[PDB]
Amino acid sequence: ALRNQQAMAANLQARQIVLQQSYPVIQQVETQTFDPANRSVFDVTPANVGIVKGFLVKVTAAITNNHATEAVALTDFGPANLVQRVIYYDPDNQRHTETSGWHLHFVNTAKQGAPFLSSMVTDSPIKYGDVMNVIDAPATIAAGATGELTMYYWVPLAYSETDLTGAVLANVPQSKQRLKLEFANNNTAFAAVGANPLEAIYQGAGAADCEFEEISYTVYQSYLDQLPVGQNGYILPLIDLSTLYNLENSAQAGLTPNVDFVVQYANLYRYLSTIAVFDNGGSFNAGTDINYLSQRTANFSDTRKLDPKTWAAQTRRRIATDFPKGVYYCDNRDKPIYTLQYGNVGFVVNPKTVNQNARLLMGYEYFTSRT
Amino acid sequence: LRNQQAMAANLQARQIVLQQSYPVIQQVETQTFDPANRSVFDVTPANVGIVKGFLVKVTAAITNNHATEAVALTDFGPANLVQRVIYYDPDNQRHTETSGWHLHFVNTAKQGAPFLSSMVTDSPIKYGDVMNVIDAPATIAAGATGELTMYYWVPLAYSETDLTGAVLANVPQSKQRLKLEFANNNTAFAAVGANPLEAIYQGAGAADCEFEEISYTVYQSYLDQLPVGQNGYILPLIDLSTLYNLENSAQAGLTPNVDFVVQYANLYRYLSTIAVFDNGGSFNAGTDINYLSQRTANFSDTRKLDPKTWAAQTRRRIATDFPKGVYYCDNRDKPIYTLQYGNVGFVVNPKTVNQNARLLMGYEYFTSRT
Amino acid sequence: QQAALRNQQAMAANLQARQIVLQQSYPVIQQVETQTFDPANRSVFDVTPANVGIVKGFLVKVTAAITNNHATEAVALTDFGPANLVQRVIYYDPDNQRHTETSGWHLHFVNTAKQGAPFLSSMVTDSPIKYGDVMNVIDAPATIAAGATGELTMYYWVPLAYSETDLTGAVLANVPQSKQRLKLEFANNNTAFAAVGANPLEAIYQGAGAADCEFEEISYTVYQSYLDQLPVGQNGYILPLIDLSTLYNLENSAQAGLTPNVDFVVQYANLYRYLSTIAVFDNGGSFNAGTDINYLSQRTANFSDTRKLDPKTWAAQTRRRIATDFPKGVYYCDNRDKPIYTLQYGNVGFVVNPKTVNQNARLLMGYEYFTSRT
Ligand SMILES: [Cl-]
Ligand SMILES: [Cl-]
Ligand code: NA
Ligand code: NA
Ligand code: NA
Ligand code: NA
Ligand code: NA
Ligand code: NA
Ligand code: NA
């Protein structure tokens, strides 16, 4: 136990020194403009330099609705669905995050404490506001019109700007990293009336005649350069750099009215946050199809069994607003769910109404060691 | 000497408790009723671990049975769904005893923004007021029924990380008492021209408004699995021997252009002060006040400010203004504390004073159990 | 050789004394002066603050009534609007040393940057309880119609100390001999109103009725924030000597010579530790939302850019700092945790590579920095 306490102390000190001595850099890695009808999957090759903290991905797109008369309107996720999936592999080909664009975006929001890169509305007479359209998409695209969209995603390796847990040391000249981006295409972006809008950007009677004109992306890599050297070479937080900080998502089915649907935290990961999306057969409701949600331990005791509005209240304290309809969030950052500290734990949803093809899309944020 | 070590130990124990125990939020009671029959309830919380506070959810349906006239929300609106709250701990010592609106304003001051609100942004992703956590229709038309939702946090512990004021109830045995007095058909509706201070809706149809029903659910927040050491449970004795209370009072006797001073009592460490200028039923946006201040006898004013400048300081604390006639003062970093009664006072020099004018004061403070 | 231990010890002593001062003294905010005037008669004032204890800064309240006397045309707020009620502010301490010397718009943008949101603004929420813009702390009508009179209110915080907890830059004002001086150069009928097609940079309103707009009056009230009842010890008053011997200043400048697709570089001077940088691209009177820029960057002598970004990505970083965008053509850069200091690395420069350059284009730079009094 002394070897550990000292190991953690050494790690923190090394982290603190790296942060004080190195200088942060953010620089463009690659940009590409394309038509997803031609290609929608791209493998970006990050530069191998210093300690890598994450990637900021700018995505723009132009969409045209050529329907003769009908419009389409943004889905609840909208531009967050411009990227369908993101997967990162480090120089040792160890996979870190692999999740959907919508889940990654919701975590970006949770970590910011407000809708990611949004512009807050105030009474200021000075002309602050949505000036630069950092994340933007027209509410509707009428028949015959073309809309322009902009979206940003932060793909994290390091947990934060000050906590390097999960960061990647990329100083091995011949071992490349891989950032795979799978973009939306005409098939995923447009949903007909009555179809499931989960993965779509726009939905409406004009959907069949909507097409992307183009999508463009620019990946910026954030890293620390001029790493401090000491009496043993680079001073590095060994625990930070051998821990993976990942996001992943999965789908669970088998819900029945008034019965507890339990999703066990199946791995021995340290779960920092959990997102549960109740895709009630293509319908996304504002809590009205749920009796309660909870986190429960094998001891059968609930640590937070709450009605939907009260559950939402806790989230409002975290992001200053509510996540979209049917999206529920749970913060476990200070005391991560770890099944080896207490019995197995489960995330619980007791549904009031269950439509055909109902399912819970689970999104997790967690730490785990490489070994 | 000493103390340095007493506080050092208290803080160490607090840290161990926060690190080792596990937080739980649990429903302890729910009830639906008709205020025509009853509006005062005494909730019995569970005696388990260290209790931090209670989240009280209140929902109500209001029917405007008037034939042709509507009513509209007052400035406090749903914050008046609970008229008063009183908490007694296992040792029969009272902590908070205040109005629902004062409790709500403190919840907002502590959050740094309107309590449990949804902030509006340009995000195209559909975040927003999706769940209507705190909600009430702006107006209820003649013949219509409106649905309202309100939440209040009754604190024992000062915060999630500062357990000062928390209550140990894992042992006490004796019961705790959380008393709640709800709005009723006599307090919720104000006629045009009547004082709207304690009401939820005001308007020409008020006389014919009534509650269809009210429901409440109390959730208790506490720490379980308390850490044990040599001498036994590791506990922050100072935290648990200190009361963190909210209290209200009313003062009258205001006259144009004369300093109206409300004295702070001794012994209490006042963290915040709220003063509501109920100018005879009229609530104005500072236009009826010359200035407000906090003053020490023989040391003058530490912050004598015009109303807008006073409001500017508040905008730095809650990112907006409190409702008309509601003034806030933050003294958290250096609490008002006098060894002599009234060695410090809160001042309001009114420009205009209507009949039946008064200041409704609200205080947040720390004080020793002994 | 070494002996640098002195610095280490000096820093510790400075921090200890700062803490003692913060713990023992009591904060006071007090009105020092209020005046109502007609800008046609005068617009420059020199305020003499009180010499009491350690001065942290000044909160300046400014109100105005503007009438648009045009027979038919209206005027509308410029992007800066009421932030241009004060054109320039300059502070001198008792030793007659200059601290902040900048434009009202720059001071206001820094007030916003340090708050983490539009300065003293009222956010909008779904709360049914009537919070909101109740007190109109900073306010100005979006337009003033022909024949109408509009009322404005704006506030500026002129900092001496860096913050309420970091007294770096604060001023000890106890010498009865020499007075401090806070100079305010206000807007007047020649700066506040821009005709259609004229440069709106320094104006409050712009539009077809501008030539007939006039101030009815402007009023200001200066409140001084300071620490009184300073703690004493064996060696007398306990005081953070480094904090009180360091200047925390805001200054602005102007540079021209931009050409399409060529890097325009503005060098940071040596000795100053730059906490933030603001660059306003006054493209010949046109202020655009990034569309006239290829990219912006901060660069060191080594061709090494630490953040060469396209305008929207640059704007994204700013949204993380103030929760919204600064007005069109206004770009912000936060270097608070690692201040730009040309001694730490080679010379450093702020870069703008413009896509389009109109005649009379220029970059207006605003800086926040720390520097030794000596
Ligand atoms: Cl009943
Ligand atoms: Cl005059
Ligand atoms: Na192809
Ligand atoms: Na609502
Ligand atoms: Na009645
Ligand atoms: Na009372
Ligand atoms: Na306003
Ligand atoms: Na003029
Ligand atoms: Na200068």
CSV table of C-alpha atoms in Angstrom, one decimal, chain B:
chain,number,residue,atom,x,y,z
B,1,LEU,CA,-4.6,29.2,22.3
B,2,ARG,CA,-6.2,25.9,21.1
B,3,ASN,CA,-9.0,26.2,18.4
B,4,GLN,CA,-6.3,26.3,15.7
B,5,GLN,CA,-6.2,22.6,16.4
B,6,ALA,CA,-9.9,22.3,17.0
B,7,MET,CA,-10.7,23.8,13.6
B,8,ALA,CA,-7.8,21.8,12.0
B,9,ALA,CA,-9.3,18.6,13.4
B,10,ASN,CA,-12.8,19.6,12.4
B,11,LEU,CA,-11.7,20.1,8.9
B,12,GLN,CA,-9.8,16.9,8.7
B,13,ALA,CA,-12.8,15.0,10.0
B,14,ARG,CA,-15.1,16.7,7.5
B,15,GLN,CA,-12.7,15.6,4.7
B,16,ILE,CA,-12.6,12.0,5.9
B,17,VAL,CA,-16.4,11.9,6.1
B,18,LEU,CA,-16.8,13.3,2.6
B,19,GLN,CA,-14.2,10.9,1.2
B,20,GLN,CA,-15.5,7.8,3.0
B,21,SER,CA,-19.2,8.1,3.3
B,22,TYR,CA,-21.6,7.8,0.3
B,23,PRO,CA,-24.3,10.4,-0.5
B,24,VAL,CA,-27.9,9.3,-0.8
B,25,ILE,CA,-31.0,11.2,-1.9
B,26,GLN,CA,-34.1,9.3,-0.9
B,27,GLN,CA,-37.8,9.9,-1.1
B,28,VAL,CA,-39.2,10.1,2.4
B,29,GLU,CA,-42.8,11.3,1.8
B,30,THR,CA,-45.4,12.1,-0.8
B,31,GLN,CA,-48.9,13.4,-0.4
B,32,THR,CA,-51.7,14.9,-2.4
B,33,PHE,CA,-54.4,17.1,-0.8
B,34,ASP,CA,-56.9,19.9,-1.3
B,35,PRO,CA,-55.9,23.1,0.5
B,36,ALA,CA,-59.6,23.7,1.2
B,37,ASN,CA,-59.2,20.9,3.8
B,38,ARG,CA,-55.6,21.2,5.0
B,39,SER,CA,-52.5,23.1,4.2
B,40,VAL,CA,-50.0,22.5,7.1
B,41,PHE,CA,-48.0,19.3,7.2
B,42,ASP,CA,-45.3,18.0,9.5
B,43,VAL,CA,-43.0,15.7,7.6
B,44,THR,CA,-40.9,13.1,9.5
B,45,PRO,CA,-37.5,12.5,8.0
B,46,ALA,CA,-35.5,9.3,8.5
B,47,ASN,CA,-32.9,9.3,11.2
B,48,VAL,CA,-30.0,8.1,9.2
B,49,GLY,CA,-26.3,9.2,9.0
B,50,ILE,CA,-25.5,12.9,8.5
B,51,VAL,CA,-28.5,14.8,7.0
B,52,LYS,CA,-27.6,17.6,4.6
B,53,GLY,CA,-30.9,18.9,3.5
B,54,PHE,CA,-34.3,18.3,1.8
B,55,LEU,CA,-35.4,18.8,-1.7
B,56,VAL,CA,-39.1,19.6,-1.7
B,57,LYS,CA,-41.0,19.1,-5.0
B,58,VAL,CA,-44.5,20.8,-5.2
B,59,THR,CA,-47.0,20.4,-8.0
B,60,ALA,CA,-50.4,22.1,-8.2
B,61,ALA,CA,-53.3,22.5,-10.5
B,62,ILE,CA,-55.1,25.9,-10.2
B,63,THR,CA,-58.5,26.4,-11.8
B,64,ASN,CA,-59.8,29.9,-12.7
B,65,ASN,CA,-63.6,29.4,-12.3
B,66,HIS,CA,-64.3,33.0,-13.2
B,67,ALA,CA,-66.8,33.6,-15.9
B,68,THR,CA,-64.7,36.1,-18.0
B,69,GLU,CA,-61.6,37.4,-16.2
B,70,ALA,CA,-58.1,36.0,-16.2
B,71,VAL,CA,-55.3,36.2,-13.6
B,72,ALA,CA,-51.5,36.5,-14.2
B,73,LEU,CA,-48.5,35.4,-12.2
B,74,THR,CA,-47.3,37.7,-9.5
B,75,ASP,CA,-43.5,38.5,-9.3
B,76,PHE,CA,-42.9,35.5,-7.0
B,77,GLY,CA,-45.4,33.2,-8.7
B,78,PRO,CA,-44.8,29.5,-7.9
B,79,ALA,CA,-42.3,30.5,-5.3
B,80,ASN,CA,-45.3,31.2,-3.1
B,81,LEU,CA,-46.6,27.6,-3.4
B,82,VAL,CA,-45.0,27.1,0.0
B,83,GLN,CA,-45.7,29.9,2.4
B,84,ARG,CA,-43.4,28.8,5.2
B,85,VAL,CA,-40.9,26.2,6.3
B,86,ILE,CA,-39.6,25.3,9.8
B,87,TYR,CA,-37.1,22.5,10.7
B,88,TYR,CA,-36.5,21.1,14.1
B,89,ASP,CA,-33.6,18.7,14.7
B,90,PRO,CA,-33.5,15.6,17.0
B,91,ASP,CA,-32.5,17.7,19.9
B,92,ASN,CA,-35.6,20.0,19.5
B,93,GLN,CA,-33.4,22.8,18.2
B,94,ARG,CA,-34.8,24.9,15.3
B,95,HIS,CA,-32.7,25.6,12.3
B,96,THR,CA,-34.4,27.4,9.4
B,97,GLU,CA,-37.7,29.2,10.0
B,98,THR,CA,-38.6,31.3,7.0
B,99,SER,CA,-40.9,32.0,4.1
B,100,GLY,CA,-41.0,30.0,0.9
B,101,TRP,CA,-40.1,33.0,-1.2
B,102,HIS,CA,-37.0,33.8,1.0
B,103,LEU,CA,-35.9,30.2,0.9
B,104,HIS,CA,-36.2,30.2,-2.9
B,105,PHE,CA,-34.2,33.4,-3.2
B,106,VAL,CA,-31.4,31.9,-1.1
B,107,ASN,CA,-31.5,28.8,-3.3
B,108,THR,CA,-30.9,31.1,-6.2
B,109,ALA,CA,-28.1,33.1,-4.5
B,110,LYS,CA,-26.3,29.8,-3.6
B,111,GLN,CA,-26.6,28.4,-7.2
B,112,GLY,CA,-25.4,31.7,-8.7
B,113,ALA,CA,-28.4,31.7,-11.1
B,114,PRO,CA,-32.2,31.4,-10.9
B,115,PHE,CA,-32.6,28.2,-9.0
B,116,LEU,CA,-33.0,25.1,-11.2
B,117,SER,CA,-33.6,27.3,-14.3
B,118,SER,CA,-32.9,26.5,-17.9
B,119,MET,CA,-30.6,29.1,-19.5
B,120,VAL,CA,-31.5,30.1,-23.1
B,121,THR,CA,-28.7,29.7,-25.7
B,122,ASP,CA,-28.3,29.7,-29.5
B,123,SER,CA,-27.6,26.0,-29.5
B,124,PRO,CA,-29.3,24.2,-32.5
B,125,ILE,CA,-29.2,21.0,-30.5
B,126,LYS,CA,-32.6,20.9,-28.7
B,127,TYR,CA,-31.5,21.6,-25.1
B,128,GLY,CA,-33.9,23.9,-23.4
B,129,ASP,CA,-36.9,23.9,-21.1
B,130,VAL,CA,-37.7,20.2,-21.9
B,131,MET,CA,-38.6,19.0,-18.5
B,132,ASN,CA,-40.3,22.1,-16.9
B,133,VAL,CA,-38.6,21.6,-13.6
B,134,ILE,CA,-39.8,24.9,-12.1
B,135,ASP,CA,-42.8,26.1,-14.2
B,136,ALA,CA,-46.0,28.0,-14.1
B,137,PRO,CA,-48.3,29.5,-16.8
B,138,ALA,CA,-47.9,33.2,-17.2
B,139,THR,CA,-51.7,33.6,-17.1
B,140,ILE,CA,-54.6,31.3,-16.4
B,141,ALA,CA,-57.7,32.4,-18.5
B,142,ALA,CA,-61.2,32.4,-17.3
B,143,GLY,CA,-62.4,28.8,-17.2
B,144,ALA,CA,-58.9,27.3,-17.6
B,145,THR,CA,-56.7,25.1,-15.3
B,146,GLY,CA,-53.0,25.7,-15.1
B,147,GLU,CA,-50.3,23.2,-13.9
B,148,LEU,CA,-47.4,24.3,-11.8
B,149,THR,CA,-44.2,22.8,-10.5
B,150,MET,CA,-41.9,24.3,-7.9
B,151,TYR,CA,-38.8,23.0,-6.1
B,152,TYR,CA,-37.2,24.2,-2.8
B,153,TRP,CA,-34.0,23.0,-1.2
B,154,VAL,CA,-34.1,23.2,2.6
B,155,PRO,CA,-30.5,23.3,3.7
B,156,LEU,CA,-29.0,21.9,6.9
B,157,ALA,CA,-25.4,21.6,5.7
B,158,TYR,CA,-24.2,24.8,4.1
B,159,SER,CA,-23.1,23.0,0.9
B,160,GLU,CA,-22.1,19.7,-0.7
B,161,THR,CA,-18.6,20.2,0.5
B,162,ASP,CA,-19.0,22.3,3.7
B,163,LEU,CA,-20.9,20.3,6.3
B,164,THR,CA,-21.3,23.3,8.7
B,165,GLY,CA,-25.0,23.1,9.9
B,166,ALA,CA,-25.5,19.4,9.0
B,167,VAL,CA,-27.4,17.2,11.4
B,168,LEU,CA,-26.3,13.9,12.9
B,169,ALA,CA,-29.3,11.6,13.0
B,170,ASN,CA,-27.9,8.1,12.7
B,171,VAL,CA,-28.3,7.9,16.4
B,172,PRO,CA,-30.5,10.7,18.0
B,173,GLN,CA,-33.6,8.4,18.1
B,174,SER,CA,-35.8,11.4,18.8
B,175,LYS,CA,-37.6,12.5,15.6
B,176,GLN,CA,-36.9,15.4,13.3
B,177,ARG,CA,-39.7,17.7,12.2
B,178,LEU,CA,-39.9,19.4,8.8
B,179,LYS,CA,-42.9,21.6,8.9
B,180,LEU,CA,-44.4,22.9,5.7
B,181,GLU,CA,-47.2,25.4,5.3
B,182,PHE,CA,-48.6,25.5,1.8
B,183,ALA,CA,-50.5,28.2,-0.1
B,184,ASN,CA,-54.3,27.9,0.1
B,185,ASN,CA,-57.3,29.5,-1.5
B,186,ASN,CA,-56.9,32.5,0.7
B,187,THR,CA,-53.2,33.2,0.1
B,188,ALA,CA,-52.6,32.2,-3.6
B,189,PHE,CA,-54.9,34.7,-5.3
B,190,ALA,CA,-54.8,38.4,-5.1
B,191,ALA,CA,-57.5,40.7,-6.4
B,192,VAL,CA,-56.6,43.7,-8.6
B,193,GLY,CA,-55.4,46.4,-6.2
B,194,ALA,CA,-54.6,44.0,-3.4
B,195,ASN,CA,-51.0,43.3,-2.1
B,196,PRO,CA,-49.5,40.5,-4.4
B,197,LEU,CA,-46.5,39.7,-2.0
B,198,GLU,CA,-47.7,36.3,-0.8
B,199,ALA,CA,-49.8,35.4,-3.8
B,200,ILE,CA,-49.2,33.2,-6.9
B,201,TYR,CA,-51.7,34.8,-9.3
B,202,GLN,CA,-53.3,38.3,-9.3
B,203,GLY,CA,-56.0,39.6,-11.6
B,204,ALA,CA,-59.7,40.4,-12.1
B,205,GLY,CA,-60.7,36.7,-11.9
B,206,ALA,CA,-58.9,36.0,-8.6
B,207,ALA,CA,-62.0,35.8,-6.3
B,208,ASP,CA,-63.0,32.8,-8.4
B,209,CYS,CA,-59.7,31.0,-8.5
B,210,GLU,CA,-59.1,27.8,-6.5
B,211,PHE,CA,-56.7,24.9,-6.1
B,212,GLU,CA,-57.9,21.7,-7.8
B,213,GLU,CA,-55.2,20.1,-5.7
B,214,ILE,CA,-51.6,20.2,-4.5
B,215,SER,CA,-49.0,17.5,-4.1
B,216,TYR,CA,-45.6,17.4,-2.6
B,217,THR,CA,-42.7,14.9,-2.4
B,218,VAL,CA,-39.9,15.4,0.0
B,219,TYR,CA,-36.5,13.9,-0.8
B,220,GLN,CA,-33.9,13.6,1.9
B,221,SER,CA,-30.2,14.0,1.2
B,222,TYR,CA,-27.8,12.5,3.6
B,223,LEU,CA,-24.4,10.7,4.0
B,224,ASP,CA,-24.4,7.0,4.8
B,225,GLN,CA,-21.7,4.6,5.8
B,226,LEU,CA,-20.0,7.0,8.1
B,227,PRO,CA,-16.2,6.4,8.7
B,228,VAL,CA,-15.2,4.9,12.0
B,229,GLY,CA,-11.8,5.3,13.7
B,230,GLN,CA,-10.2,4.6,17.1
B,231,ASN,CA,-12.5,6.6,19.4
B,232,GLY,CA,-15.4,5.6,17.1
B,233,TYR,CA,-17.1,7.6,14.3
B,234,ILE,CA,-14.9,10.3,12.8
B,235,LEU,CA,-17.0,13.5,12.8
B,236,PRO,CA,-16.5,17.2,12.3
B,237,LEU,CA,-17.6,18.4,15.8
B,238,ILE,CA,-17.6,22.1,14.9
B,239,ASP,CA,-19.7,21.5,11.7
B,240,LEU,CA,-22.2,19.4,13.6
B,241,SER,CA,-22.3,21.9,16.5
B,242,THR,CA,-23.1,24.9,14.3
B,243,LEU,CA,-26.5,25.9,13.0
B,244,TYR,CA,-26.9,27.1,9.4
B,245,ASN,CA,-30.3,28.8,9.4
B,246,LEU,CA,-32.4,31.1,7.2
B,247,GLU,CA,-34.8,33.4,9.0
B,248,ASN,CA,-37.2,36.2,8.1
B,249,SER,CA,-38.5,39.3,9.9
B,250,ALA,CA,-40.6,42.4,9.1
B,251,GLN,CA,-39.9,46.0,10.0
B,252,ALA,CA,-42.0,49.2,9.5
B,253,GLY,CA,-41.6,52.9,10.2
B,254,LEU,CA,-40.2,54.2,6.9
B,255,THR,CA,-40.3,57.9,6.1
B,256,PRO,CA,-39.2,59.7,2.9
B,257,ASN,CA,-35.5,60.6,2.8
B,258,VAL,CA,-34.7,59.3,6.2
B,259,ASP,CA,-32.4,56.4,6.9
B,260,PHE,CA,-34.4,53.3,7.9
B,261,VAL,CA,-32.0,51.0,9.8
B,262,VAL,CA,-32.5,47.3,10.6
B,263,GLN,CA,-30.1,46.2,13.3
B,264,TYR,CA,-28.3,42.9,13.0
B,265,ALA,CA,-28.3,40.8,16.2
B,266,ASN,CA,-25.1,39.8,17.9
B,267,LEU,CA,-23.7,36.2,18.0
B,268,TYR,CA,-24.9,35.4,14.5
B,269,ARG,CA,-22.5,35.3,11.6
B,270,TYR,CA,-24.7,36.7,8.8
B,271,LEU,CA,-23.8,35.3,5.3
B,272,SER,CA,-26.4,37.1,3.3
B,273,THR,CA,-29.2,39.6,3.6
B,274,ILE,CA,-32.3,40.1,1.5
B,275,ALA,CA,-34.6,43.1,1.9
B,276,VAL,CA,-37.9,43.3,0.2
B,277,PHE,CA,-39.5,46.8,-0.1
B,278,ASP,CA,-43.2,46.1,0.1
B,279,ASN,CA,-44.2,49.7,-0.5
B,280,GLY,CA,-47.8,49.4,0.5
B,281,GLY,CA,-48.4,46.6,-2.0
B,282,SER,CA,-46.4,48.3,-4.7
B,283,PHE,CA,-43.1,46.7,-5.8
B,284,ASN,CA,-40.8,49.1,-7.7
B,285,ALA,CA,-37.5,48.6,-9.5
B,286,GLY,CA,-35.5,50.9,-7.3
B,287,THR,CA,-37.3,54.1,-8.2
B,288,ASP,CA,-38.7,54.5,-4.7
B,289,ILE,CA,-35.3,54.2,-3.0
B,290,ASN,CA,-32.5,56.8,-2.7
B,291,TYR,CA,-29.9,54.3,-1.5
B,292,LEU,CA,-29.2,51.1,0.4
B,293,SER,CA,-26.2,50.4,2.6
B,294,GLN,CA,-24.7,48.4,5.5
B,295,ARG,CA,-23.4,50.5,8.3
B,296,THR,CA,-21.3,50.2,11.5
B,297,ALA,CA,-22.0,52.5,14.4
B,298,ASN,CA,-19.1,55.0,14.5
B,299,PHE,CA,-17.4,53.6,11.3
B,300,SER,CA,-20.0,54.8,8.7
B,301,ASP,CA,-21.1,53.0,5.5
B,302,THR,CA,-19.2,50.1,4.0
B,303,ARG,CA,-21.3,50.1,0.8
B,304,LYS,CA,-23.8,53.0,0.5
B,305,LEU,CA,-25.0,52.6,-3.1
B,306,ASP,CA,-27.7,53.9,-5.4
B,307,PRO,CA,-30.2,51.2,-6.4
B,308,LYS,CA,-28.8,50.4,-9.8
B,309,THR,CA,-25.2,50.1,-8.5
B,310,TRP,CA,-26.5,47.9,-5.7
B,311,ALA,CA,-28.2,45.8,-8.4
B,312,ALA,CA,-25.0,45.6,-10.3
B,313,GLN,CA,-23.3,43.9,-7.4
B,314,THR,CA,-26.1,41.4,-7.3
B,315,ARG,CA,-25.8,40.7,-11.1
B,316,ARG,CA,-22.3,39.5,-10.4
B,317,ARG,CA,-23.7,37.0,-7.9
B,318,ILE,CA,-26.8,35.6,-9.7
B,319,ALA,CA,-26.3,36.7,-13.3
B,320,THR,CA,-29.5,38.6,-13.4
B,321,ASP,CA,-31.7,40.8,-11.1
B,322,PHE,CA,-34.0,39.5,-8.4
B,323,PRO,CA,-37.7,40.6,-8.9
B,324,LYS,CA,-38.8,44.2,-8.4
B,325,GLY,CA,-38.3,45.5,-4.9
B,326,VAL,CA,-36.1,42.6,-3.9
B,327,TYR,CA,-32.6,43.5,-2.8
B,328,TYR,CA,-29.7,41.1,-2.0
B,329,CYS,CA,-26.5,41.6,-0.2
B,330,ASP,CA,-23.6,38.9,-0.1
B,331,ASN,CA,-21.4,38.9,3.0
B,332,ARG,CA,-20.2,35.3,2.7
B,333,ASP,CA,-16.5,35.8,2.7
B,334,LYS,CA,-16.7,38.2,5.7
B,335,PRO,CA,-20.0,37.6,7.6
B,336,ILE,CA,-21.6,40.4,9.5
B,337,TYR,CA,-20.7,39.6,13.1
B,338,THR,CA,-20.9,42.0,16.1
B,339,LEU,CA,-20.3,41.2,19.7
B,340,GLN,CA,-22.7,44.0,20.6
B,341,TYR,CA,-26.4,44.0,19.4
B,342,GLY,CA,-26.8,46.2,16.4
B,343,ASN,CA,-23.2,47.3,16.1
B,344,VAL,CA,-24.1,46.9,12.4
B,345,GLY,CA,-27.3,47.7,10.5
B,346,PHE,CA,-28.8,47.3,7.1
B,347,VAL,CA,-29.9,50.6,5.7
B,348,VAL,CA,-32.6,51.7,3.3
B,349,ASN,CA,-33.2,55.4,2.7
B,350,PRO,CA,-36.6,55.6,0.8
B,351,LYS,CA,-37.5,58.2,-1.8
B,352,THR,CA,-41.2,57.4,-1.7
B,353,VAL,CA,-43.2,55.8,1.1
B,354,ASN,CA,-46.8,54.6,0.6
B,355,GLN,CA,-49.2,53.7,3.3
B,356,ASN,CA,-48.5,50.3,5.0
B,357,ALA,CA,-44.9,50.3,3.8
B,358,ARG,CA,-42.5,47.8,5.3
B,359,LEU,CA,-39.2,46.0,4.7
B,360,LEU,CA,-39.4,42.2,4.7
B,361,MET,CA,-36.0,40.9,5.8
B,362,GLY,CA,-34.4,37.6,5.1
B,363,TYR,CA,-31.2,36.3,6.6
B,364,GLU,CA,-28.8,33.4,6.1
B,365,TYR,CA,-26.5,32.9,9.1
B,366,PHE,CA,-24.3,30.6,11.2
B,367,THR,CA,-24.5,30.4,15.0
B,368,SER,CA,-23.3,28.0,17.7
B,369,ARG,CA,-25.7,25.6,19.3
B,370,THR,CA,-24.3,26.6,22.6
